[PDB]
Amino acid sequence: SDYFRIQLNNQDYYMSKPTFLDPSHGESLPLNQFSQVPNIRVFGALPTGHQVLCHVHGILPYMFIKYDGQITDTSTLRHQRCAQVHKTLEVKIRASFKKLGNLNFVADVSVVKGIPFYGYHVGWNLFYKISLLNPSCLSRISELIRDGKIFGKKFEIYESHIPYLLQWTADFNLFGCSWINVDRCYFRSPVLNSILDIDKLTINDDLQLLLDRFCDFKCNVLSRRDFPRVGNGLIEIDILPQFIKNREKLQHRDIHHDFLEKLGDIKPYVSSARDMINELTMQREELSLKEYKEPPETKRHVHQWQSSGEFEAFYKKAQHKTSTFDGQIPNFENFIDKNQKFSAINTPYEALPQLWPRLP
Amino acid sequence: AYKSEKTAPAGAVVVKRRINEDHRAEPQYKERIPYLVVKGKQGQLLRERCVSPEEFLEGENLELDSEYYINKILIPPLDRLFNLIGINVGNWAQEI
Amino acid sequence: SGFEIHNFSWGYIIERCQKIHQFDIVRELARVKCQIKLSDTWGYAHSSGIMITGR
Amino acid sequence: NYWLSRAQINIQLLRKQDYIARNIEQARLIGIDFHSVYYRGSQFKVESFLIRICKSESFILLSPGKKDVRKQKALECVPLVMEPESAFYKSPLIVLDFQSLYPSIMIGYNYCYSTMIGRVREINLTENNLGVSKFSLPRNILALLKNDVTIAPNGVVYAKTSVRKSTLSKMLTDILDVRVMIKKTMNEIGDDNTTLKRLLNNKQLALKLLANVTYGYTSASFSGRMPCSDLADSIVQTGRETLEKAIDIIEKDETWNAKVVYGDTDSLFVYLPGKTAIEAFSIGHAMAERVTQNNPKPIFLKFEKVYHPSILISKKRYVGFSYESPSQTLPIFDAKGIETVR
DNA sequence: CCCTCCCCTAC
DNA sequence: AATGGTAGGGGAGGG
Numbered sequence: 001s002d003y004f005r006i007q008l009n010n011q012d013y014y015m016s017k018p019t020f021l022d023p024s025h026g027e028s029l030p031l032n033q034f035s036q037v038p039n040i041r042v043f044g045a046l047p048t049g050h051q052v053l054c055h056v057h058g059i060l061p062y063m064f065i066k067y068d069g070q071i072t073d074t075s076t077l078r079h080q081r082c083a084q085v086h087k088t089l090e091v092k093i094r095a096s097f098k099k100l101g102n103l104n105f106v107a108d109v110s111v112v113k114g115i116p117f118y119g120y121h122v123g124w125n126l127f128y129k130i131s132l133l134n135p136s137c138l139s140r141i142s143e144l145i146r147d148g149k150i151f152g153k154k155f156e157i158y159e160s161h162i163p164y165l166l167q168w169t170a171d172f173n174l175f176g177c178s179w180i181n182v183d184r185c186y187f188r189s190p191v192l193n194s195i196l197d198i199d200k201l202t203i204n205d206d207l208q209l210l211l212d213r214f215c216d217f218k219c220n221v222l223s224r225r226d227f228p229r230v231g232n233g234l235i236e237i238d239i240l241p242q243f244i245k246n247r248e249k250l251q252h253r254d255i256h257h258d259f260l261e262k263l264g265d266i267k268p269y270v271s272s273a274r275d276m277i278n279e280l281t282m283q284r285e286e287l288s289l290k291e292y293k294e295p296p297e298t299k300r301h302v303h304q305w306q307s308s309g310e311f312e313a314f315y316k317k318a319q320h321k322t323s324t325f326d327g328q329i330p331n332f333e334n335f336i337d338k339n340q341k342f343s344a345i346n347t348p349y350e351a352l353p354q355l356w357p358r359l360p
Numbered sequence: 361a362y363k364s365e366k367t368a369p370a371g372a373v374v375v376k377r378r379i380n381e382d383h384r385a386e387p388q389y390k391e392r393i394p395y396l397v398v399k400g401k402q403g404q405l406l407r408e409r410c411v412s413p414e415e416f417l418e419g420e421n422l423e424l425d426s427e428y429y430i431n432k433i434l435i436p437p438l439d440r441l442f443n444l445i446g447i448n449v450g451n452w453a454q455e456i
Numbered sequence: 457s458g459f460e461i462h463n464f465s466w467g468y469i470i471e472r473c474q475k476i477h478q479f480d481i482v483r484e485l486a487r488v489k490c491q492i493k494l495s496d497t498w499g500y501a502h503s504s505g506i507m508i509t510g511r
Numbered sequence: 512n513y514w515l516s517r518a519q520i521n522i523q524l525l526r527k528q529d530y531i532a533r534n535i536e537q538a539r540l541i542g543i544d545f546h547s548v549y550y551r552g553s554q555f556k557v558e559s560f561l562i563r564i565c566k567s568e569s570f571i572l573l574s575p576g577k578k579d580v581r582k583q584k585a586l587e588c589v590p591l592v593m594e595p596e597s598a599f600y601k602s603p604l605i606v607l608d609f610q611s612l613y614p615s616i617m618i619g620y621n622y623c624y625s626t627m628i629g630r631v632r633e634i635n636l637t638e639n640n641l642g643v644s645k646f647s648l649p650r651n652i653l654a655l656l657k658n659d660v661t662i663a664p665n666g667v668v669y670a671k672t673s674v675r676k677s678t679l680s681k682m683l684t685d686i687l688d689v690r691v692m693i694k695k696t697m698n699e700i701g702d703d704n705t706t707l708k709r710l711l712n713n714k715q716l717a718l719k720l721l722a723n724v725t726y727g728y729t730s731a732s733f734s735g736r737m738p739c740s741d742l743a744d745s746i747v748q749t750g751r752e753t754l755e756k757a758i759d760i761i762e763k764d765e766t767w768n769a770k771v772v773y774g775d776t777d778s779l780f781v782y783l784p785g786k787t788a789i790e791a792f793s794i795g796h797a798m799a800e801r802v803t804q805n806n807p808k809p810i811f812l813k814f815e816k817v818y819h820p821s822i823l824i825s826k827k828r829y830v831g832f833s834y835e836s837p838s839q840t841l842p843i844f845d846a847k848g849i850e851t852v853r
Numbered sequence: 854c855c856c857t858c859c860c861c862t863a864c
Numbered sequence: 865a866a867t868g869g870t871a872g873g874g875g876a877g878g879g
């Protein structure tokens with residue numbers, strides 16, 4: 001293929017001081033630098049079989065909170081509210097851990113739109129996207145916010161039971177023990193490590209072709225002093241989130257912000273199941289078996305339960321209780337308040353590329 | 361993961377005895393510890409006999425508790441399966 | 457691997473190096489020289505109590 | 512040679528059990544890494560599946576704390592375990608069981624976090640309690656959705672399939688399609704490769720466990736990261752109701768003078784006095800077909816096996832001679848819970 | 854006669 | 865340190 005492929009065998013993260021390969025500023029507080037940034041170490045193997053160490057920069061853990069503002073903001077009060085909540089959060093966590101400004105815990109706070117999952121909600125909802133710098137403290141921050149040890153009231157926290165590595169893989173369309181496709185990458189100063197004779201013994205024609213195609217020794221290779229090798233493997237590389245080509249292959253559907261499904265506007269939802277199905281079909285082809293199919297059957301179901309009548313009466317009473325006094329009957333075309341100026345806000349998958357290093 | 365030494369299982373007694381004789385003989389978590397029961401004084405607790413196979417084979421005068429095995433381990437399941445027919449294996453055992 | 461890695465195989469070597477030789481063989485067996493913390497009772501009780509970086 | 516044989520033998524044990532390949536396949540399918548397949552619990556796998564599915568439709572997932580889960584309503588709905596008539600059955604005993612009962616129910620009835628409105632009683636707009644969250648409802652949400660809703664047997668309003676197709680349904684149908692293909696491929700081969708059949712059986716068991724723990728993400732009242740007592744109560748209650756409806760359907764027919772003598776949460780033991788064990792297969796296929804056609808689309812009743820000589824001792828404890836197919840000649844000793852299997 | 858603790862299984 | 869639920873039965877030890 002035309003991609004530097006690295007299988008995701010083992011993954012881990014560590015905290016390090018920022019460099020020019022990692023972000024150093026936040027949107028909410030552009031004048032405050034980052035004390036440290038998290039990096040992800042990916043231990044994998046090239047298709048030729050040689051092991052490789054990959055350093056991933058620019059990935060920060062995040063969580064969502066309810067937005068305290070209004071949907072009528074002029075895109076400038078939103079920035080002020082984000083900056084104020086960022087400052088308050090940073091001060092409160094610094095006090096709890098036991099102006100100024102060093103940004104040791106919180107990186108950036110942003111406003112995004114979204115549809116909550118726990119319950120039936122149709123309209124767009126605004127959320128605070130709090131990006132943290134240390135993945136290990138995420139549970140502590142969530143607990144502090146939940147019990148109202150930071151703000152006046154007790155907030156509800158979204159997307160915190162998802163681990164940092166799982167969240168990163170889900171965001172970047174990465175699967176365990178699967179290829180990570182990158183268009184380009186940065187190489188460490190010794191391209192082929194020589195622990196004992198590893199460079200000489202493991203050298204290969206396919207490896208040489210891969211290195212010639214993907215390493216230029218004038219731009220890809222990093223400085224020895226600035227980026228010393230840390231891995232006990234043959235090849236060590238540093239990549240950026242833009243380099244990962246496994247993303248941009250996810251299918252994003254915006255159907256939950258209104259009754260698009262009911263109005264008629266616009267099967268393999270799990271991407272990994274197709275590979276297993278193909279493998280099984282190929283494996284059963286080796287036995288000269290026929291093709292796979294399943295015959296459906298018609299069903300004459302009507303399915304009233306034991307207390308269906310009581311439930312119907314209660315639903316009628318609830319409909320009477322929760323309804324506007326007279327007025328026009330609701331319609332599927334006008335129930336959601338249109339022209340709400342929601343296009344200015346960012347969908348969660350569009351907020352990910354923000355704060356990326358964006359190197360030359 | 362036991363409330364007390366009194367509530368410990370029969371295999372726990374054997375494992376603890378082996379640990380007492382040598383501290384490196386500590387079993388892993390959820391590891392099956394084999395043991396046998398041997399003849400003893402009347403009224404002795406089941407966990408009091410609890411002979412390990414290593415101790416049972418090296419024991420000069422250790423005999424399997426034939427009465428305990430035949431009654432407790434054999435009669436109840438056979439009775440449960442055969443009382444639905446109308447017969448009990450206890451009479452057959454007592455006749456032999 | 458190893459049939460029982462806690463009392464034997466790699467666990468015996470790790471314990472011996474930590475006790476007698478005062479050697480951190482776990483760091484040497486990892487795929488990263490630097491940057492590697494606490495005992496994991498869940499791993500010991502359930503599966504693979506030992507943890508080597510990258511393996 | 513003692514130690515060389517030990518090392519080679521453990522390597523061969525891992526190779527024969529196909530541990531590495533099976534774990535690699537599971538990690539590839541779920542999306543978690545190699546270590547987390549056997550190190551972490553099932554909730555991690557369910558979380559990976561759910562997050563990967565939900566991120567594409569901009570679903571923001573609630574993350575309740577320990578206190579929120581501890582204050583969740585208790586589970587009231589329980590599975591139906593019929594008390595057996597402890598006896599010896601010389602006549603053929605036809606057993607029937609739904610395939611993936613709870614996942615099939617979740618797919619068919621559109622039970623999910625995202626399709627639930629609230630309890631049909633105590634809806635008051637201002638404040639509704641449902642699961643581990645307290646929320647509010649729009650002004651005319653119920654009047655607008657007066658037709659495209661379904662009511663769970665425990666009294667929880669769910670959106671119909673016409674609007675808000677559930678994500679749990681999507682992941683479950685993908686998993687169940689893979690499992691059905693695996694099972695049909697395994698059944699299509701007879702004695703050609705015993706090892707291949709064993710590997711396929713392991714795969715289908717893993718997929719079934721994945722579906723069951725996807726159901727069990729809810730009802731995780733203890734050590735649950737995002738549970739919902741109402742959703743699990745609805746699933747269990749409609750499973751019990753489906754089982755009771757199947758019992759009534761089978762016992763109502765006068766062509767077969769058959770009575771249900773025992774039944775698990777989804778299984779169904781039907782006694783056929785003096786039916787020659789060759790009419791039993793046809794009768795059981797007919798009952799399975801009728802019950803399947805009397806239920807929603809994903810719900811399906813399988814014929815399973817026939818216990819010609821059988822003994823029902825107690826609940827979750829029986830033994831009998833199994834005849835999976837009419838072409839089978841030598842019965843398979845099938846025992847559940849009795850001293851032979853413990 | 855009844856209760857508690859422990860082991861293991863079936864869904 | 866991490867953990868998905870439900871129900872069911874039997875045996876040893878102590879009252």
Ligand SMILES: Nc1ccn([C@H]2C[C@H](O)[C@@H](COP(=O)(O)OP(=O)(O)OP(=O)(O)O)O2)c(=O)n1
Binds near residue numbers: 723727777
């Ligand atoms: N470990 C398990 C086993 C079962 N169940 C629940 C959910 C299942 O829907 C139901 C019935 O389980 P079965 O073992 O009968 O299996 P399934 O019906 O899910 O599938 P299949 O019949 O294909 O084996 O019990 C569960 O929650 N956890």
Ligand SMILES: [Ca+2]
Binds near residue numbers: 608609612
């Ligand atoms: Ca079933």
